[model samples]
Target: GSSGSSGPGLRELCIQKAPGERLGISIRGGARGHAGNPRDPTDEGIFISKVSPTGAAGRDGRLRVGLRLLEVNQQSLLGLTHGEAVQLLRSVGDTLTVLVCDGFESGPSSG
Candidate 1:
């Protein structure tokens, strides 16, 4: 189910890797704890902090800063450690599908 609205909506994205293809990028846990939704106090996930401009991830043009990584190969990454997240990406010998959430900017304050 995809929303037709414009501002801030959930998107289910799928990225496939070619045989022996490499995903050149780096990921780090969010410094403040939560990944995307700032309203939630305990919503945590893997955060894509950076992407190499000339690497596979950057060239693909899908990954970007502020994107929250939620799942990998259909497995939830709710409480996985930083190292664990890296291991998951490395273990994907073939195709890799990651579920991520985007466009979670702080809404206009009521003040």
Candidate 2:
């Protein structure tokens, strides 16, 4: 479902821990909240916000570099703020599951 003002809430997201993998929250604050923009239908797709240099995501080897966040863990990031999403990632205490929308594998479309 799309993220509307009175729409459903965002699904919970979590990450599976690796042997030595450290997790942290990633804050990508660049969402352009379009006024009166009825809400986008493309819910699950990656919107690669600038890679975090100080977060656990920065250390991920194949975290789909420059990928967009399609879903969080498995939840659709429909109605979420760049900061709010980041907080969720941090909740995992250094490890968080991030499902992103990759352009390389998905397709080249303007963000």
Candidate 3:
């Protein structure tokens, strides 16, 4: 289903999850600009490495393994370290709001 456009059709998704709940997703920082490129500290967005079928995020059915995390709790994750991102996720106590998009689209980049 090609839209005949060079732009990526990125989708924004909001997901809520409680603390201690099973998000069951693994993520890694997209520090590398491109293939075999040096890691960029300014690289933003967390790449969804894995998703647990029985976990909360998996059950939501909107999040995919290749999705990229853009924001959490309305806070932009751009230029944040991997540890910082994890801290942000933990900062959300009762509920977590995550904004994600597909990777193939033309979206945020580290520059």
lDDT of each residue in 49-107, candidate 2, tens digit only = 44443435544543434555566555556666655555555555334556553344433
- Where does candidate 1 stray beyond 4 Å? 1-9, 30-44, 103-111
Which portions of model 3 show Cα errors greater than 4 Å?
1-12, 18-20, 30-44, 104-111
Question: Each model's number of backbone clashes?
Answer: 0, 11, 0
Query: Model 1 over residues 54-100: C-alpha lDDT tens digits?
Result: 55556665666556777777766656677777778667765677676
- Judged by whole-model lDDT over C-alpha atoms, candidate 2 comes out at 0.46
Measured over all alpha carbons after superposition, the RMSD of each candidate to the real structure, in angstroms, is: 7.2, 10.5, 7.7
Q: Sum up the clashes in candidate 2.
A: 11
Q: All models: lDDT?
A: 0.62, 0.46, 0.62
**Candidate 3 Cα lDDT to native:** 0.62
Error of 1 at 58 (Å): 1.1
Top candidate (TM-score): 1
- TM-scores, in order shown? 0.63, 0.45, 0.61
The best-first sequence of candidates by lDDT reads: 3, 1, 2
Residue 11 lDDT (model 3): 44
